[PDB]
Design a protein around this nucleic acid. Sequence first.
RNA 1: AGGUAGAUUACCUGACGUUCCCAUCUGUGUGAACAUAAUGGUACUGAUCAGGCUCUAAGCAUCUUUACUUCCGUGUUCGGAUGGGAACGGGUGUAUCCUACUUGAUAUGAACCUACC
RNA 2: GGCGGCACAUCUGUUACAAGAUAACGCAGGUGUCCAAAGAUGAACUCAAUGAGGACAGAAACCUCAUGUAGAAUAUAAGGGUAUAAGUUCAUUUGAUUAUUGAUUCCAGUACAAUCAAUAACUCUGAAAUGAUGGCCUAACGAUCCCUAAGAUUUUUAAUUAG
RNA 3: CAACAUCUUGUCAAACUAUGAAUAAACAAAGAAGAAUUCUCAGUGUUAAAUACACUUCAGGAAUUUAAAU
Lengths: 170, 57, 165, 60
Amino acid sequence: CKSDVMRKIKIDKLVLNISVGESGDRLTRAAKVLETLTGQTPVLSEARYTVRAFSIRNDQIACHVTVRGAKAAEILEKGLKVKEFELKANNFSATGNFGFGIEEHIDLGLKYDPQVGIYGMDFFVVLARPGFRVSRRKRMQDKIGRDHLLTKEDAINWFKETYEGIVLNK
Amino acid sequence: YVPHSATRFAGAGENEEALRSRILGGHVAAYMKYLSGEDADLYKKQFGRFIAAGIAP
Amino acid sequence: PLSNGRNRRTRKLFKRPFRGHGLSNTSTILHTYKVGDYVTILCNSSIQHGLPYKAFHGKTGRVWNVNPHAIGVMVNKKVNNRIVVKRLHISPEHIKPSGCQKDFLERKAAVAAIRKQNIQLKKEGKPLLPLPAKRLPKQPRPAELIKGADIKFTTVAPLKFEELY
Amino acid sequence: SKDKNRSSHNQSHKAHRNGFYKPKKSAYMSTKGMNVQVLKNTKAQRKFALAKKLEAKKAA
RNA sequence: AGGUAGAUUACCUGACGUUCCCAUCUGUGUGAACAUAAUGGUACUGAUCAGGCUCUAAGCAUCUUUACUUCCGUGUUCGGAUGGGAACGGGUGUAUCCUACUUGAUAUGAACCUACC
RNA sequence: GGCGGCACAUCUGUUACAAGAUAACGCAGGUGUCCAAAGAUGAACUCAAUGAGGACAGAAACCUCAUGUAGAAUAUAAGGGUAUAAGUUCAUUUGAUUAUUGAUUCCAGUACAAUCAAUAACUCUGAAAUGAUGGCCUAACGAUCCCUAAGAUUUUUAAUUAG
RNA sequence: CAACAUCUUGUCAAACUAUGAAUAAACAAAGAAGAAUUCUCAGUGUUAAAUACACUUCAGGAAUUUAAAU
C-alpha cells in the first residue's frame, strides 16, 4: 500500500530534431523521413537570429517532432540500439533528461533513394513522474516539489534497468 | 434568463437530437454498448461501478 | 523652457507608485458614488483612455452627476485674477473617495446621538443632556501639583565638546 | 536691440488688488449635460406637479 | 476540518527541509463520440483501479524579503529676521519645522458569503 | 549689423525652485512621416538572459528541462504604461460610419486643433458581461475670398373620383 | 594567471532612485437661503418585482424641538 507507485519514473516525451542550414528541398526531405520514422507530420522551425556566417530570419531551418507513450518507447529502442546502449555519464542533464545523436538515419533499405541522401538526427528523452501535470494544467498552475523532481542520478538508474545499458565514465 | 447564443451547445452542428441525446446521456449509453461489443475487461475497467450498481446502458 | 504638450513634465507625476504597478483594486470600480459626495482626482497613468488633465491631479471636487461609466466631478480652477467652475466626467479609475469631512461627519453623529436622547428625556421628565463642547485650540494648561514621592531629578548642563574623529 | 523676455514680477501683487473673484452660487447649480434618464425623471415629475397645481388654481 | 466565490493585495513572496487526508480538493485511468492540437503533454470528454508522491492547506528555522515599533537624531536640511562675524569662500546666535539610510525588538496574516464533513 | 543658426508652428527629459505659471542664439534629442493592419474583438502562449544537456554545431543556427518582475517587445525621439498583456501566434471583421448634444486642454476663457461623456441608428467580435466613432499616451499641422466634390426621394401639396 | 561568482571597502549623478522633509497647493469645520426629528407621502425610472434605490425647491404637506457646531 506504499505510495511508491506514484514515483514511477517513465518517459513522457521524446523529441527528434533535424537541424539543417538550408531552406527548401532538403528540409522537405528531412521532414519526410520523420513522417516515416514516427508516423506523424513534424513541425518546421524558423530562424531566431539571422547570421551571414551561417548563411541564414523568417526562413524554415529545422524540423522537430515529439512522440509520447508506447510509440516513443520503440523509437527509443531503435535509436539506443544504434549506439548499442553505450551512453556516457556526461549525457545526462542535471534536470533528469538525457540525449544523444546519430549520423545516418538507418530508416529502410528496401526502397532507398539518393535524392533523400543521408541525414543526421538527435534524440532527447524527457522523463517524468505521475503527478507532473500540476505545472502544465491551465488552472492552478503550480511548481513540482524538489523531492518529486528528478535528477541526473535518478535518470541514470532508470536507464540502467529498463535497458540495462551501462554508462561510461571515461 | 441567461443571455447566450446557441452555437456552443452539444449541437452547433449535427442537429437538435445530437444535443438532446447528449442531455439524456446518449454518449454514455452508446459507450458501453460499444465497449462491451469489443472487450470485457475494458468494459469492466471503464464502467466498474455501473456494472455493480445494475445500471443497464 | 518647456513644450506645450498635454502631458508634459510627467516623469514623476504620472509614474506608478513603487511596487504599485499592474491592475488596480476591485473596490475602485465597486465604490458607489452619489451626487454631492467629495472626491479626489488622481490620474491613473495605467489607463490612458479618459485620463484627466495633469493640472487637476490631487484636486478635491464634488460629484455633480453620475453616468453609466463616468462620474461627474466639479472642481474649482484658478485663472488670471478670478476663479472658474470646471465640470468634468471622469471614470472611477481616476477618482477616489475623499476623506475631507471625516472629522465633520462624526461630530454630526455625536450631536445626533445626544439630540435623540433629549427626545427620550424631556417627555419622560428627566433632565436633558447638553450638546458636545465645541472645538478649541490648545488652551493654556492649568495649575496642578506634582508629587514628590515618585519624582526624580536629572541635572542639565552644556556638554563638553567631544571630537568625532 | 535685445529686450527682457518675460517676468512674473509684480503679478501676484496685481492679482490680489481686486482679489480672486469667486463664482456665485448659481454657477454650481447648473444642470447642463446631466444624465438623460435623470433629466427625464425630473421633467416628468415637474410637469405632473405643475399641472395639478394649475388645475386647482383654475377651479377657483 | 475542507471546497467554491472573493475583498485587503508579500504579516500573503522566495529557498531548505517536514504533517495529515476521515469527508472534500488534487493528482489518477481511458480515448468512442462534442471538441483538440506535430504529440489524449495542453485543452475536451468518459470514468473510479489504486495514492497522499507532488500539489493545496498547517506548522520549523539566530532563513533573505516584507509590515509595524524605539533608536539613528533633534543629526542633514529648512521658513523668518541684524549697521551679526569673514577680504573671499562659506559658516553663527535668535524665535521655529524636522526627514532619510542604518541597527535593535516583534510578527509571518487578518477577514466575508454558500455547501458539505 | 552682416555671415552662420531657427531658439518662427511644434514634442520628450533637464535647467525648474515637491500646486499652477515659468528665461537665455541654456543642455541632450525629436516632427512635417508610417500602417487593410501596425484599427476592432476573441482565443492560446510568455519575453531578454543564465545554468545543464543533444551529430556536424564552434562564442553566434535548432531542440529539451529548470530559474527567469519584464532586465524583451511595443513603427519612430525621450519619458511614462503593459505579463492568463497593451508583447508573440492564430481566427473573424471594417466602428478608420451617419445624426444631435454637453464639457476639458492652449484659451482673450475667440477660431483652429486635440481630449472626452452621452443619446438615436446600422453593424463587427465574443457564449457572455463588456469592447469598438482609428493607431497604448504625450508632436505628426492650417483662416476670409476662390475653385472642386458629396447630401436634401421621409414630407407637404395641386387636380380628379367615393363618402 | 586572469576570468567569473560572493562578502566587505572609498567616493559620485541636472537629464539615477527606494525613502523623503521645511515652505506650499486644493478641501471640510452646517446657506434652496440657520438645524434636527416624527408622521404622512406622489411622478418617472432602476429593479426579477420591489415597501430598497436615484432625481424631483433633502418633490410636496403637517406638527415638535431649535440660533449649536475652531
